[PDB]
């Protein structure tokens, strides 16, 4: 028995990450095992750590938490540093539009857990942490129970399957800060402090939790690792483009008919995600824009791009918020501005004041109270949140809004 | 100030859980809010001691994290998403229903002191917008009559 959760629709063409999580219910360990689960761990533990890193590298697996960094490479970089090492699963998923990670957590926790154990063995971590946002209480309890299940069966603890490898997984809860998703802030939170991002360098893979080499990976990234071991890197590479291989989760929301998570290859185009899979727009309205979470804005001219991490690709976390012709872009921009206003940690002055002023001024623009100087001020502020910023939030807090200014000049002009 | 035995048990549990005591700080604060309906200022000096942390650290942690409330006591917190997708799909309809049923607005507590409406950023359930929570429970808003039934489960 767990706290109530919504029933998010899920659909898959690959039947990998959503093999079970396409059904909205907790799949416990016996059902996981009946479905061939914990086979990858077995196979992995018969491989050397260096072999696993090699396979994950050759798989072309990339981080699914936003930065799209090659996972194998991250592991390689970490293990260049003497241990002990920590492995951290990032389950803070708090960006607007993004609800992809939770359906793995809440429906198929053993997929994630199996991934964490394999990844931990790979980098020589005997201690792992899931940092899950506080607003996912069910996820927290589901994971706590699942970990104990795996422990009962001998997939955690000491001498896992006689391999000589020891692992414990601890579950930490966040407490309502989006910035705790940033890997250094997460680590600060993990050590029982405020979620203030650290000045980098150093980077976590050298100095992270307790200053020790630390690998942070997104829930979805880690969820791929069992399939890489199981199928082999070659077969995994055949899934979608050789360039950006494997399944990807696409959380699709807004004015589509069939909002939910879609498991699709990353050579799927944005037009396909909306129209082929998500059933087009509510009332067959014209797409005006697609917000990539709170990161980017794509116009209706940019629908024929792939959902991969190529230069002209959608990128990000594959979060698809669909705006139609009836939706006001300035109103939407304000919401995105409001998000950044409420989530800046306040350490850096331009981020601190910029996030605030962008929202403050944009609200005046929307309310029709803005002076000419307010407009000019809004322009300047939007372009000057990033300076001195020591994390990615300051660098992107004005990105989407700027794209709306460039791509939808007419709509903004109305408000002038 | 003294923690009741039943709460203190659970706090010591959290402290034992992680390899280092201080790591339990958010689990402890979560626990305290659930027990009291808020974080009593006077609760933090005994917490800090259990954590082996300076009071100033514990206080700053409470201040930073948006989920912890130091001012208002409330049995049940109705976290209403006010972010982009929920706004698109009808946050203000949900707020209207809450106003009809409870007579309160975002940031307010019923005179009863049992419900507080807490505006929050994206709850990571956007496909099911508009979304809200009642404490740990999470729901899509469908209609006033549904909301009434949902809220009636909390006494
Ligand atoms: C403001 C901000 C918020 C972030 N939020 C998340 C998040 O919720 N989940 C996540 O996995 N990564 C998040 N990240 C990215 C992490 O810092 C990091 O890139 C990622 O967790 C690494 O794992 P991956 O390589 O498997 O994607 C965030 C970064 C920033 C700057
Ligand atoms: S850039 Fe913004 S969010 Fe990041 S550390 Fe600086 S003030 Fe905090
Ligand atoms: S915008 Fe409300 S759940 Fe995401
Ligand atoms: Cl096998
Ligand atoms: Cl950076
Ligand atoms: Cl200690
Ligand atoms: Cl509030
Ligand atoms: Na509107």
Q: Cα(B155)–Cα(B146) distance, rounded to whole angstroms?
A: 16
The helix (run of H) or strand (run of E) holding residue B29 is helix B25-36
Query: Ligand 5 centre from A207 Cα, in Å?
Result: 15
Q: Is A221 annotated as a binding residue?
A: yes
* Cα angle, residue A406 at apex, residues A401 and A409 outer, rounded to 5°: 100
Candidates A192, A260, A332, A334, partner chain B, best to mutate (most B CBs within 10 A): A192
Phi-psi region of A15 (alpha: psi -120 to 50; beta: other; left: phi over 0): left
Q: Cα(A341)–Cα(A355) distance, rounded to whole angstroms?
A: 5
Q: Cα(A186)–Cα(A178) distance, rounded to whole angstroms?
A: 10
User: Which of A60, A91, A111 is where one domain is finished?
Assistant: A60
The helix (run of H) or strand (run of E) holding residue B81 is strand B76-81
Query: A234 and A124 in one domain?
Result: yes
Q: Cα(A27)–Cα(A76) distance, rounded to whole angstroms?
A: 33
A416 class by beta-carbon count within 10 Å (0-12 exposed, 13-18 middle, 19+ buried): exposed
Give yes or no for a contact between B15 and B51, defined as CB atoms under 8 angstroms apart: yes
Put simply, whether A336 touches B (Cβ < 8 Å) is yes
* Cα angle, residue A241 at apex, residues A237 and A245 outer, rounded to 5°: 45
Query: B60 and B18 in one domain?
Result: yes
* C-alpha distances out from residue B54 to A193, B71, B148, Å: 12, 22, 44
Q: Where in the sequence is the domain holding B55, given as residue range(s)?
A: 5-64
Q: What SS3 string covers chain A?
A: CCCCCCCCCEEECCCCCCCCCCCCCCCCHHHHHHCCCCHHHHHHHCCCHHHHHHHHHHHCCECCCCCCCEHHHHHHHHHCCCCCEEEEEEECCCCCCCCHHHHHHHHCHHHHHHHHHHHHHHHCEEEEEEEECCCCHHHHHHHHHHHHHHHHHCCCECCHHHCCCCEEEEEEECCCCHHHHCHHHHHHHHCCCCCCCCCCCCCCCCCCHHHCCEEEEEHHHHHHHHHHHHHCHHHHHCCCCCCCCCEEEEEEEECECCCEEEEEECCCEHHHHHHHHCCCEHHHCCEEEEEECCCEEEECCCCCCECCCCCCCCCCCCCEEEEECCCCHHHHHHHHHHHHHHHCCCCCHHHHHHHHHHHHHHHHHHHCCCCHHHHHHHHHHHCCCCCCCCCHHHHHCCHHHHHHHHHCHHHHHHHC
Query: Ligand 6 centre from B23 Cα, in Å?
Result: 9
Q: How far, in whole angstroms, is CA B75 from its chain's centroid?
A: 9
Query: Ligand 4 centre from A229 Cα, in Å?
Result: 8
Count structural domains, chain A.
4
Work out the angle between the directed axes of helices A399-407 and A329-343 (0-180°, nearest 10).
170
φ, ψ of residue A242 to 5 degrees: the values are -50, -20
Give yes or no for a contact between A289 and A329, defined as CB atoms under 8 angstroms apart: yes
Q: Cα(A55)–Cα(A62) distance, rounded to whole angstroms?
A: 13
CATH of the domain at A276: 3.10.20.600
Which tokens is A359 given?
């929202």
Count structural domains, chain B.
2
In angstroms, the first-to-last Cα distance of chain A is: 54
Three-state DSSP at B20 gives coil
The helix (run of H) or strand (run of E) holding residue B8 is helix B5-17
Candidates B21, B22, B24, B26, partner chain A, best to mutate (most A CBs within 10 A): B26
Q: Cα(A99)–Cα(A109) distance, rounded to whole angstroms?
A: 15
Query: A56 and A102 in one domain?
Result: no
Residue B113 within a domain: yes
Q: What is the layout of strands, in order, in the sheet containing A125-132? A: A168-173, A125-132, A85-91, A214-218
Pairing type for strands A168-173 and A125-132 reads: parallel
Q: What SS3 string covers B112-133?
A: CCCEEEEEECCCCCHHHCCEEE
How many CB atoms are closer than 10 A to CB A297? 26
In angstroms, how far apart are the furthest CA atoms of chain A? 72
Q: Is B122 annotated as a binding residue?
A: yes
Q: Cα(A30)–Cα(A250) distance, rounded to whole angstroms?
A: 28
Query: B45 and B13 in one domain?
Result: yes
Query: B94 and B48 in one domain?
Result: no
- Chain B residue closest to A333 (CA)? B84
Q: Cα(A270)–Cα(B99) distance, rounded to whole angstroms?
A: 39
Q: Cα(A190)–Cα(A172) distance, rounded to whole angstroms?
A: 7
CA nearest to A144, candidates A177, A109, A117: A109
User: Which of A43, A60, A77 is where one domain is finished?
Assistant: A60
Residue B138 within a domain: yes
**Upper half-sphere CA count for residue A176 (Cβ side, 13 Å):** 18
- Which ligand lies nearest to the CA atom of residue A70 in the structure? 1
Q: Residue ranges of the alpha helices (H) in B52-142?
A: 55-64, 84-89, 91-102
Q: Cα(A45)–Cα(A161) distance, rounded to whole angstroms?
A: 8
CATH of the domain at B119: 3.40.30.10
Which tokens is B116 given?
């507080």
φ, ψ of residue B78 to 5 degrees: the values are -95, 95
Which tokens is B12 given?
């010591």
- Return all residues near B134 (Cβ < 8 A) that are at least 6 apart: B76, B77, B78, B79, B150, B151, B154
Q: Where in the sequence is the domain holding A360, given as residue range(s)?
A: 328-416
- Chain A residue closest to B68 (CA)? A175
Which tokens is A331 given?
């109103």
User: Which of A60, A75, A107 is where one domain is finished?
Assistant: A60
Q: Cα(A107)–Cα(B60) distance, rounded to whole angstroms?
A: 35
Q: Which residue has the tokens 């390899």?
A: B19
Give B29's contacts in chain A (Cβ within 8 Å): 175
* C-alpha distances out from residue A306 to A241, A295, A345, Å: 10, 17, 33
DSSP 8-state secondary structure symbol assigned to residue B82: -
CA nearest to A317, candidates A145, A98, A144, A123: A98
Query: A402 and A271 in one domain?
Result: no
Residue B15 within a domain: yes
Residue B70 within a domain: no
Residue B117 within a domain: yes
Question: Ligand 2: residues whose CB is within 6 Å?
Answer: A 179, 197, 344-348, 351-352, 389-391, 393-394
Q: What is the layout of strands, in order, in the sheet containing B131-134? A: B115-120, B76-81, B131-134, B137-140
Q: Which atom of ligand 1 is nearest to the CA of A392?
A: 31
Contact B85 A97 (CB under 8 A): yes
* C-alpha distances out from residue A105 to A91, A93, A223, A269, Å: 9, 11, 10, 27
């Amino acid at each position: 028995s767990y706290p109530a959760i919504p029933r998010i629709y899920a659909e898959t063409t690959l039947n990998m990450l959503l093999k079970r999580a396409k059904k909205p219910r907790v799949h416990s360990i016996d059902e996981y095992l009946k479905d061939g689960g914990y086979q990858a761990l077995e196979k992995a533990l018969n491989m050397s750590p260096e072999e696993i890193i090699d396979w994950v590298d050759k798989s072309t697996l990339r981080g699914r938490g936003g930065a799209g960094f090659p996972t194998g490479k991250k592991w390689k970089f970490a293990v260049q540093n003497p241990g002990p090492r920590y492995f951290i699963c990032n389950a803070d998923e708090s960006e607007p539009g993004t609800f992809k990670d939770r359906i793995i957590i809440e429906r198929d926790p053993h997929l994630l857990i199996e991934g964490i154990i394999i990844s931990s063995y790979a980098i020589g971590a005997n201690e792992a942490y899931i940092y899950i946002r506080g607003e996912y209480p069910a996820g927290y309890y589901i994971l706590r129970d699942a970990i104990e299940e795996a422990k009962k069966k001998g997939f955690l603890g000491k001498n896992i399957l006689g391999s000589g490898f020891d692992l414990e997984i601890y579950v930490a809860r966040g407490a309502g800060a989006y910035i705790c998703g940033e890997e250094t802030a997460l680590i600060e939170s993990l050590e029982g402090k405020r979620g203030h991002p650290r000045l980098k360098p150093p980077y976590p893979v050298q100095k992270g939790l307790w200053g020790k080499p630390t690998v942070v990976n997104n829930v979805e990234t880690i969820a791929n690792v069992p399939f890489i071991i199981s199928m082999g890197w070659e077969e995994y590479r055949y899934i979608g483009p050789s360039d950006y291989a494997g399944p990807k989760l696409f959380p699709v929301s807004g004015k589509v008919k069939k909002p939910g998570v879609y498991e699709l290859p990353m050579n799927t185009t944005l037009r396909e995600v909306i129209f082929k899979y998500a059933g087009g727009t509510l009332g067959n309205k014209k797409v005006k824009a697609v917000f990539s979470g709170a990161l980017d804005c794509f116009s209706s001219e940019e629908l024929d791009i792939p959902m991969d991490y190529s230069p002209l690709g959608f990128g990000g976390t594959g979060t698809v918020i669909v705006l139609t012709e009836e939706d006001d872009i300035v109103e939407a921009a304000l919401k995105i501005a409001e998000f950044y206003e409420h989530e800046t940690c306040g350490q850096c002055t331009p981020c601190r004041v910029g996030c605030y002023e962008q929202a403050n001024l944009l609200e005046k623009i929307y309310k029709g109270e803005a002076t000419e100087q307010d407009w000019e001020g809004f322009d300047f502020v939007n372009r000057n949140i990033q300076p001195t910023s020591i994390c990615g939030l300051g660098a992107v807090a004005g990105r989407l809004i700027r794209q709306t200014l460039e791509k939808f000049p007419e709509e903004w002009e109305k408000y002038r | 100030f003294e923690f009741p035995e039943e709460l203190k048990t659970k706090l010591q549990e959290h402290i034992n859980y992680f390899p280092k005591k201080r790591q339990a700080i958010l689990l402890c604060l979560h626990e305290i809010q659930n027990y009291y309906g808020y974080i009593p200022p006077e609760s933090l000096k005994p917490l800090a001691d259990m954590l082996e942390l300076p009071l100033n650290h514990v206080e700053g942690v409470v201040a930073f994290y948006d989920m912890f409330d130091r001012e208002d006591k409330a049995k049940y917190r109705i976290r209403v998403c006010v972010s982009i997708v929920c706004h698109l799909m009808g946050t203000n309809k949900l707020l209207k229903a809450l106003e009809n049923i409870l007579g309160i607005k975002p940031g307010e507590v019923t005179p009863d002191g049992k419900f507080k409406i807490v505006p929050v950023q994206c709850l990571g359930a956007c496909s099911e917008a508009p979304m809200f929570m009642v404490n740990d429970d999470e729901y899509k808003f469908e209609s006033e009559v549904q909301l009434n039934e949902i809220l009636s489960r909390y006494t």
